[PDB]
């Protein structure tokens, strides 16, 4: 019998990650890995082992190429011809957090356990957060050289 994690025995932790001048894709991938908890060696798909990750200053996120005017986030309200058209520039101008939020919702397991994990992520626009009472630990994403 292998190991499966208990209900409350699982442990969380808080990290804050600035997004200034960070590549959107790489930041999203690292955030999703940490969110699901794959870094932890207690990972078990049925029960999340992730950590509350808080993203700060999300308006300065950067993307490669000329995407800044040719990325096309989509959605449809629900009625015929209710298709909605938007670009990264407009999205950042009007509601920034949505960019990273959509990026990571795409990565998370689209089942409901993933819909839940989605909760434990929070993204802000400016370099400040009312979550200062949880002592988040700065977490700069790095690669294992090889």
């Amino acid at each position: 019998p292998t190991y499966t994690p208990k209900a409350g025995d699982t442990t969380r932790s808080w990290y804050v990650i600035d997004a200034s001048d960070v590549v959107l894709g790489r930041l999203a991938s690292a955030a999703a890995t940490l969110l699901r908890g794959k870094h932890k060696p207690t990972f078990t798909p049925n029960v999340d082992g992730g950590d509350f990750v808080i993203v700060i200053n999300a308006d300065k996120i950067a993307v490669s190429g000329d995407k800044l005017t040719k990325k096309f986030a989509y959605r449809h309200s629900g009625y015929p011809g209710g298709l909605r058209k938007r670009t990264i520039g407009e999205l950042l101008e009007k509601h920034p957090t949505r960019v990273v939020e959509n990026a990571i919702i795409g990565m998370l397991p689209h089942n409901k356990l993933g819909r839940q994990i989605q909760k434990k992520l929070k993204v802000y626009a400016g370099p400040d957060h009312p979550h200062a009472a949880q002592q988040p630990i700065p977490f700069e994403i790095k690669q294992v050289a090889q």
């Binding site: 190991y3 932890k40 207690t42 090889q146």
Partner: protein
Amino acid sequence: RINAAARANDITYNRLIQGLKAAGVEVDRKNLAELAVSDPAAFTALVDVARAALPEDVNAPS
């Protein structure tokens, strides 16, 4: 689980397996995972063994 443990110990799972084999260990991934979640100290020792058994150059054509 093994990949998670190796990365937390600063090594990639494939390298852990390669070094472990090159050292000629006969333990399998079930025991690997159970240890990795039970005795991080033993997992650390095993990863040091794997790294030490890891040759100097990894890109050598030989």
